Enzyme design. Sequence first.
Site, PDB file in Angstrom:
ATOM      1  CG  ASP A  30      -8.994  55.724  -0.520  1.00  0.00           C
ATOM      2  OD1 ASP A  30      -8.338  54.724  -0.013  1.00  0.00           O
ATOM      3  OD2 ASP A  30      -8.546  56.893  -0.326  1.00  0.00           O
ATOM      4  CG  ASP A  39      -7.115  49.363  -7.562  1.00  0.00           C
ATOM      5  OD1 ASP A  39      -7.586  50.135  -8.442  1.00  0.00           O
ATOM      6  OD2 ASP A  39      -5.887  49.093  -7.656  1.00  0.00           O
ATOM      7  CE1 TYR A 102     -23.291  57.957  -4.667  1.00  0.00           C
ATOM      8  CE2 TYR A 102     -24.890  59.721  -5.293  1.00  0.00           C
ATOM      9  CZ  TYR A 102     -24.312  58.909  -4.300  1.00  0.00           C
ATOM     10  OH  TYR A 102     -24.778  59.043  -3.005  1.00  0.00           O
ATOM     11  CE1 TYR A 128     -18.008  59.964 -16.027  1.00  0.00           C
ATOM     12  CE2 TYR A 128     -19.596  61.579 -16.914  1.00  0.00           C
ATOM     13  CZ  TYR A 128     -19.085  60.834 -15.836  1.00  0.00           C
ATOM     14  OH  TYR A 128     -19.621  60.983 -14.561  1.00  0.00           O
ATOM     15  CE  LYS A 132     -20.798  56.773 -13.768  1.00  0.00           C
ATOM     16  NZ  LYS A 132     -20.277  56.188 -12.495  1.00  0.00           N
TER      17      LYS A 132
HETATM   18  N1  LIG Z   1     -17.983  65.335 -10.888  1.00  0.00           N
HETATM   19  C1  LIG Z   1     -19.156  65.399 -11.576  1.00  0.00           C
HETATM   20  O1  LIG Z   1     -19.518  66.503 -12.032  1.00  0.00           O
HETATM   21  C2  LIG Z   1     -19.996  64.148 -11.736  1.00  0.00           C
HETATM   22  C3  LIG Z   1     -19.929  62.975 -11.066  1.00  0.00           C
HETATM   23  N2  LIG Z   1     -20.790  61.835 -11.300  1.00  0.00           N
HETATM   24  C4  LIG Z   1     -20.716  60.528 -10.531  1.00  0.00           C
HETATM   25  O2  LIG Z   1     -20.855  60.832  -9.176  1.00  0.00           O
HETATM   26  C5  LIG Z   1     -19.970  59.943  -8.497  1.00  0.00           C
HETATM   27  C6  LIG Z   1     -18.988  60.784  -7.742  1.00  0.00           C
HETATM   28  O3  LIG Z   1     -18.553  61.949  -8.437  1.00  0.00           O
HETATM   29  P1  LIG Z   1     -17.344  62.854  -7.884  1.00  0.00           P
HETATM   30  O4  LIG Z   1     -17.316  62.572  -6.400  1.00  0.00           O
HETATM   31  O5  LIG Z   1     -17.757  64.225  -8.435  1.00  0.00           O
HETATM   32  O6  LIG Z   1     -16.049  62.403  -8.696  1.00  0.00           O
HETATM   33  P2  LIG Z   1     -14.648  62.367  -7.998  1.00  0.00           P
HETATM   34  O7  LIG Z   1     -13.642  62.290  -9.136  1.00  0.00           O
HETATM   35  O8  LIG Z   1     -14.373  63.430  -6.954  1.00  0.00           O
HETATM   36  O9  LIG Z   1     -14.757  60.886  -7.356  1.00  0.00           O
HETATM   37  C7  LIG Z   1     -14.591  59.636  -8.002  1.00  0.00           C
HETATM   38  C8  LIG Z   1     -13.675  58.721  -7.186  1.00  0.00           C
HETATM   39  O10 LIG Z   1     -13.169  57.621  -7.923  1.00  0.00           O
HETATM   40  C9  LIG Z   1     -11.782  57.443  -7.487  1.00  0.00           C
HETATM   41  N3  LIG Z   1     -11.022  56.655  -8.402  1.00  0.00           N
HETATM   42  C10 LIG Z   1     -10.284  56.990  -9.533  1.00  0.00           C
HETATM   43  N4  LIG Z   1      -9.745  55.882 -10.029  1.00  0.00           N
HETATM   44  C11 LIG Z   1     -10.122  54.877  -9.241  1.00  0.00           C
HETATM   45  C12 LIG Z   1      -9.856  53.520  -9.302  1.00  0.00           C
HETATM   46  N5  LIG Z   1      -9.061  52.878 -10.243  1.00  0.00           N
HETATM   47  N6  LIG Z   1     -10.407  52.742  -8.302  1.00  0.00           N
HETATM   48  C13 LIG Z   1     -11.212  53.250  -7.285  1.00  0.00           C
HETATM   49  N7  LIG Z   1     -11.485  54.587  -7.233  1.00  0.00           N
HETATM   50  C14 LIG Z   1     -10.927  55.355  -8.209  1.00  0.00           C
HETATM   51  C15 LIG Z   1     -11.295  58.832  -7.433  1.00  0.00           C
HETATM   52  O11 LIG Z   1     -10.025  59.143  -6.794  1.00  0.00           O
HETATM   53  P3  LIG Z   1      -8.593  59.718  -7.376  1.00  0.00           P
HETATM   54  O12 LIG Z   1      -8.710  59.962  -8.865  1.00  0.00           O
HETATM   55  O13 LIG Z   1      -8.353  61.029  -6.633  1.00  0.00           O
HETATM   56  O14 LIG Z   1      -7.608  58.604  -7.068  1.00  0.00           O
HETATM   57  C16 LIG Z   1     -12.439  59.433  -6.665  1.00  0.00           C
HETATM   58  O15 LIG Z   1     -12.323  59.160  -5.295  1.00  0.00           O
HETATM   59  C17 LIG Z   1     -19.352  58.989  -9.551  1.00  0.00           C
HETATM   60  O16 LIG Z   1     -20.121  57.879  -9.897  1.00  0.00           O
HETATM   61  C18 LIG Z   1     -19.395  59.848 -10.756  1.00  0.00           C
HETATM   62  O17 LIG Z   1     -19.346  59.234 -12.011  1.00  0.00           O
HETATM   63  C19 LIG Z   1     -21.753  61.943 -12.297  1.00  0.00           C
HETATM   64  C20 LIG Z   1     -21.932  63.029 -13.029  1.00  0.00           C
HETATM   65  C21 LIG Z   1     -21.256  64.272 -12.548  1.00  0.00           C
HETATM   66  C1  LIG Z   2     -10.818  74.622 -21.191  1.00  0.00           C
HETATM   67  C2  LIG Z   2     -12.017  75.459 -20.865  1.00  0.00           C
HETATM   68  C3  LIG Z   2     -13.127  74.937 -20.165  1.00  0.00           C
HETATM   69  N1  LIG Z   2     -14.187  75.734 -19.884  1.00  0.00           N
HETATM   70  C4  LIG Z   2     -15.430  75.211 -19.265  1.00  0.00           C
HETATM   71  C5  LIG Z   2     -16.123  74.484 -20.439  1.00  0.00           C
HETATM   72  C6  LIG Z   2     -16.863  73.275 -19.892  1.00  0.00           C
HETATM   73  O1  LIG Z   2     -18.180  73.122 -20.448  1.00  0.00           O
HETATM   74  C7  LIG Z   2     -16.799  73.592 -18.389  1.00  0.00           C
HETATM   75  C8  LIG Z   2     -17.042  72.392 -17.464  1.00  0.00           C
HETATM   76  O2  LIG Z   2     -15.776  71.877 -17.071  1.00  0.00           O
HETATM   77  P1  LIG Z   2     -15.533  70.517 -16.271  1.00  0.00           P
HETATM   78  O3  LIG Z   2     -16.699  70.452 -15.310  1.00  0.00           O
HETATM   79  O4  LIG Z   2     -14.065  70.464 -15.859  1.00  0.00           O
HETATM   80  O5  LIG Z   2     -15.614  69.338 -17.354  1.00  0.00           O
HETATM   81  P2  LIG Z   2     -16.030  67.853 -16.924  1.00  0.00           P
HETATM   82  O6  LIG Z   2     -16.061  66.907 -18.110  1.00  0.00           O
HETATM   83  O7  LIG Z   2     -15.213  67.341 -15.732  1.00  0.00           O
HETATM   84  O8  LIG Z   2     -17.558  68.195 -16.501  1.00  0.00           O
HETATM   85  C9  LIG Z   2     -18.508  67.167 -16.356  1.00  0.00           C
HETATM   86  O9  LIG Z   2     -17.984  66.080 -15.585  1.00  0.00           O
HETATM   87  C10 LIG Z   2     -18.781  64.899 -15.596  1.00  0.00           C
HETATM   88  C11 LIG Z   2     -18.056  63.998 -14.592  1.00  0.00           C
HETATM   89  C12 LIG Z   2     -20.252  65.300 -15.280  1.00  0.00           C
HETATM   90  O10 LIG Z   2     -21.271  64.316 -15.574  1.00  0.00           O
HETATM   91  C13 LIG Z   2     -20.776  66.602 -15.872  1.00  0.00           C
HETATM   92  O11 LIG Z   2     -22.039  66.889 -15.353  1.00  0.00           O
HETATM   93  C14 LIG Z   2     -19.758  67.721 -15.702  1.00  0.00           C
HETATM   94  O12 LIG Z   2     -19.512  68.044 -14.342  1.00  0.00           O
HETATM   95  O13 LIG Z   2     -15.484  74.221 -18.252  1.00  0.00           O
HETATM   96  C15 LIG Z   2     -14.170  77.024 -20.316  1.00  0.00           C
HETATM   97  O14 LIG Z   2     -15.117  77.768 -20.127  1.00  0.00           O
HETATM   98  N2  LIG Z   2     -13.144  77.597 -20.970  1.00  0.00           N
HETATM   99  C16 LIG Z   2     -12.043  76.894 -21.284  1.00  0.00           C
HETATM  100  O15 LIG Z   2     -11.084  77.436 -21.887  1.00  0.00           O
END
Ligand SMILES: NC(=O)C1=CN([C@@H]2O[C@H](COP(=O)(O)OP(=O)(O)OC[C@H]3O[C@@H](n4cnc5c(N)ncnc54)[C@H](OP(=O)(O)O)[C@@H]3O)[C@@H](O)[C@H]2O)C=CC1
Ligand SMILES: Cc1cn([C@H]2C[C@H](O)[C@@H](COP(=O)(O)OP(=O)(O)O[C@H]3O[C@@H](C)[C@H](O)[C@@H](O)[C@H]3O)O2)c(=O)[nH]c1=O
EC number: 1.1.1.133
Lengths: 298, 298
Positions: A30, A39, A102, A128, A132
Site C-alpha cells: 500500500d 505510492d 478496477y 472521478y 478513471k
Molecule cells: N468504492 C466504490 O464504490 C468503487 C470503487 N471502484 C474501483 O475499485 C477499486 C477499489 O475500490 P475500493 O476498494 O472501493 O476503494 P478504496 O478507497 O477502499 O480503495 C482504494 C485504495 O487506494 C488507496 N490510496 C489512496 N491514495 C493513494 C495513493 N496516493 N497511493 C496508493 N494508494 C492510495 C486507498 O487508501 P487510503 O485512502 O485509506 O490511504 C485505498 O487503499 C479502485 O480502482 C476503484 O476506483 C470503482 C467504482 C466503485
Molecule cells: C450527503 C448525502 C448523501 N446521500 C447518498 C447520496 C449518494 O447518491 C449516496 C452514495 O454515496 P457514496 O457512495 O458515499 O458516494 P461516492 O461518490 O463515494 O459513491 C460512488 O463512489 C465511486 C467510487 C463509485 O464508482 C460509485 O459506484 C459509488 O460507489 O449517498 C444521501 O442520501 N443523503 C445525503 O444527505
Amino acid sequence: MNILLFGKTGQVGWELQRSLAPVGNLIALDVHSKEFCGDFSNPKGVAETVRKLRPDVIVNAAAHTAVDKAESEPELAQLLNATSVEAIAKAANETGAWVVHYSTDYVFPGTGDIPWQETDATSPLNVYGKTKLAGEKALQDNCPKHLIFRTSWVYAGKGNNFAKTMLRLAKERQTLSVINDQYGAPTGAELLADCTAHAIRVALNKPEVAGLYHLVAGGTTTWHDYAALVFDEARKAGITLALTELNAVPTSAYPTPASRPGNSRLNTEKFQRNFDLILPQWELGVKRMLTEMFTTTT
Amino acid sequence: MNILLFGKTGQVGWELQRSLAPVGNLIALDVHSKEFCGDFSNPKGVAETVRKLRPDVIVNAAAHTAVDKAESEPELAQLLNATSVEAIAKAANETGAWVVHYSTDYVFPGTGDIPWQETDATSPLNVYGKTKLAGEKALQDNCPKHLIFRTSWVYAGKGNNFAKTMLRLAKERQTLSVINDQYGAPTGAELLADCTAHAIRVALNKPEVAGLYHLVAGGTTTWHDYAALVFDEARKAGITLALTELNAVPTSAYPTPASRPGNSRLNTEKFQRNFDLILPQWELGVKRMLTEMFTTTT
Ligand SMILES: NC(=O)C1=CN([C@@H]2O[C@H](COP(=O)(O)OP(=O)(O)OC[C@H]3O[C@@H](n4cnc5c(N)ncnc54)[C@H](OP(=O)(O)O)[C@@H]3O)[C@@H](O)[C@H]2O)C=CC1
Ligand SMILES: Cc1cn([C@H]2C[C@H](O)[C@@H](COP(=O)(O)OP(=O)(O)O[C@H]3O[C@@H](C)[C@H](O)[C@@H](O)[C@H]3O)O2)c(=O)[nH]c1=O
Ligand SMILES: NC(=O)C1=CN([C@@H]2O[C@H](COP(=O)(O)OP(=O)(O)OC[C@H]3O[C@@H](n4cnc5c(N)ncnc54)[C@H](OP(=O)(O)O)[C@@H]3O)[C@@H](O)[C@H]2O)C=CC1
Ligand SMILES: Cc1cn([C@H]2C[C@H](O)[C@@H](COP(=O)(O)OP(=O)(O)O[C@H]3O[C@@H](C)[C@H](O)[C@@H](O)[C@H]3O)O2)c(=O)[nH]c1=O
Ligand SMILES: [Mg+2]
C-alpha cells in the site's frame, strides 16, 4: 507464479489479499509500503516496483476514489487514476505481465432506463469518472494483456461504504433523509475479489479474454431501498435503531459537489459468458456483510 | 450450473457461501433448513434433498466435529460423518454429480517427524477420525466423481476455534497453560473455501482430479507457538491482555477424553500440482482473521 497487489488495505484490496493468496505467490503493498513502493502519487515509483519485482500478474486495487474531493483536487486524481496506471501498464507490457485494474460506472452519463453495456458510449458527468476513464484508456493503449473491471456501489465489511455510513446515522437518528431516483447495483468487495481470482486463472490460459468487463452484482435498486433493506436487517438483528421516520427523496433536492449519474445500471452479460461465472443478486452479498457486522462479540 | 451446500453456517461453510456464490447457482442449507432438508442425523432426509434438487456439485461442510463429545456419542458421529455421507454419495452418483467433502488428519495415528501423505497408511487414534475415515471410504466406494479435502486445525473469524477460545482465556487470565509437542498447520476457513471453488472448476473440466487431497495451510507449528503468536497479535493491537505468565507443556501432562495425534503435519504437494494452486504459510491466514477481529467498532 507471481502476483503483485496495490491498494491492499482498501475494500476490494483487503479481499484480494484473501482471494489471490492461493492463485499465486502474493506480494501485497500500500501507500505506506516501506521496503517497497506502493505510492500511486509517484507514477515512476509504482512503475519502478513493477519493473523491480517483474510480476506475472498485477492487481491494482489502489486508487483515488474520493469522488467529491476529486472535483476540488482533480490533478491529484489524474496522478493516481490515470498517470500511475498509465506508467504501471507501460511497465507491465515490457515484462508481458497481466494488468488487472478496477474502474467505474461513473464513466457513463446519467440518461436512465436501459442498462449500460461494454461497447456503449462514454460521457463522464464528473471528474472521478473522467480521470478513471483516462486511466482505463491509458491502460488499454499501453498494455493489451489487461483486465478492466468496471464496477459500482462497492461496499465491504471492513472499510467505508454507503451501508456503513447509512447505519451510523440511523442508530444516532430519529428522522432521516436519502435518495430514491438513482438506479444501480451494490457490489461486494468479496464478489469483486473472488471473480478477480477466477478471471486471472482464465486469462492466463486464454489471453483472448483480455479486455473490458462490466463487473457488478446482479439486479438493480435505489440508494433509498438499499438503505431501507439495511435498516430491516439491523432491525431483524434486534438492534434498537433510533429511526422512527424514514424519508425518501429524488436526487436534486440535496446537493453534492460532483454530478452523480442517475442510470448506474451496468450490464454484465459479457463477464458471465466470458469467465463462465455467476453474478448473484445484490441483496445476498449485502445481507452477508451485515450479518458479520451484527455478530458483535469479541 | 447448480451447486448444493450443507453446513453453511459453520466455519468453512460460511466461507463457502461466499466462495461458491459466483462458481455456480447456490442453494445453501443447514440443520434448521425448513423448506428443504439439511439435517445430517437423517441420512435418508439429506439423501432425499440431493435426489430432490439434482445438483451438479454438492459441497458437504456439514458434519459432527465435536471430537471429545464423539467418544461419548459415537453412534451419532457415525450417522453424520459416515452414514449421511454414504447416503449423500450414493444419491449423487445416480445424477452423476460431483461430491465435495471435508475430512480430517485425525484419520492418521501420531508417530511424528516426517509429514503425512495421501497414499500413506491410516490408523485413527480416536473415534472422530475413525468415523470420518469411514465416511471418506464410503464416499470413495459409492461415488468416484468425488473431491475429498483432508484438512486440519481449522479456524475462521466467525465460528468457534482454538485461537478464539485461547484469546478469551488470555484476556480473562493472568497465568495460562497449553501444549508444545503437537506438531501441525492451522488452516483458515477462507483458504479451504477459496481453494474449494477453484478445485470445483478444475474438476468439472478435468474429471481426472477426482480423488483425495490433503488440503492445509503451509508450514507447521505447535499449539503453544500458535497461541503465543495469537497473543503477540493481540498485544500488537494494543489490547490489555491480562496475561503476564505464559506456560508451555508436553501433551500428556493434561487429559483429554479422545486421543489426539502428535504428528498432524500433512503434506499437500499433491493438491498444489493437481489444482495449480498455492497454499501459503499458516501465519498469514491467522494474522488476517485476527486483524478483522481486532477491528472492534460498529
Ligand atoms: N468504492 C466504490 O464504490 C468503487 C470503487 N471502484 C474501483 O475499485 C477499486 C477499489 O475500490 P475500493 O476498494 O472501493 O476503494 P478504496 O478507497 O477502499 O480503495 C482504494 C485504495 O487506494 C488507496 N490510496 C489512496 N491514495 C493513494 C495513493 N496516493 N497511493 C496508493 N494508494 C492510495 C486507498 O487508501 P487510503 O485512502 O485509506 O490511504 C485505498 O487503499 C479502485 O480502482 C476503484 O476506483 C470503482 C467504482 C466503485
Ligand atoms: C450527503 C448525502 C448523501 N446521500 C447518498 C447520496 C449518494 O447518491 C449516496 C452514495 O454515496 P457514496 O457512495 O458515499 O458516494 P461516492 O461518490 O463515494 O459513491 C460512488 O463512489 C465511486 C467510487 C463509485 O464508482 C460509485 O459506484 C459509488 O460507489 O449517498 C444521501 O442520501 N443523503 C445525503 O444527505
Ligand atoms: N474444525 C476443524 O478443525 C476441522 C474440520 N474438518 C471438516 O471440515 C468440515 C467443516 O469443518 P468446520 O466448518 O471447521 O466445522 P464446524 O463445526 O464449524 O461445521 C460443521 C457443521 O455441521 C453442522 N452440524 C452439526 N450437527 C449437524 C447435523 N445433525 N446435521 C447437519 N449439520 C450439522 C454444524 O452446526 P451446529 O453444531 O452449530 O448446529 C456445522 O454447521 C467438516 O467436514 C469437518 O469434519 C476436518 C478437520 C478439521
Ligand atoms: C483443555 C485444554 C486444551 N488445550 C489445547 C489442547 C489441544 O491439542 C488444543 C486443540 O483444541 P481443539 O482444536 O478445541 O480440539 P479439537 O478436537 O476440536 O481439534 C481438532 O478438531 C478436529 C475437528 C480437527 O480435525 C483437528 O485438526 C483439530 O482442529 O487445545 C490446551 O492447551 N490446554 C487445555 O487445558
Ligand atoms: Mg471475510
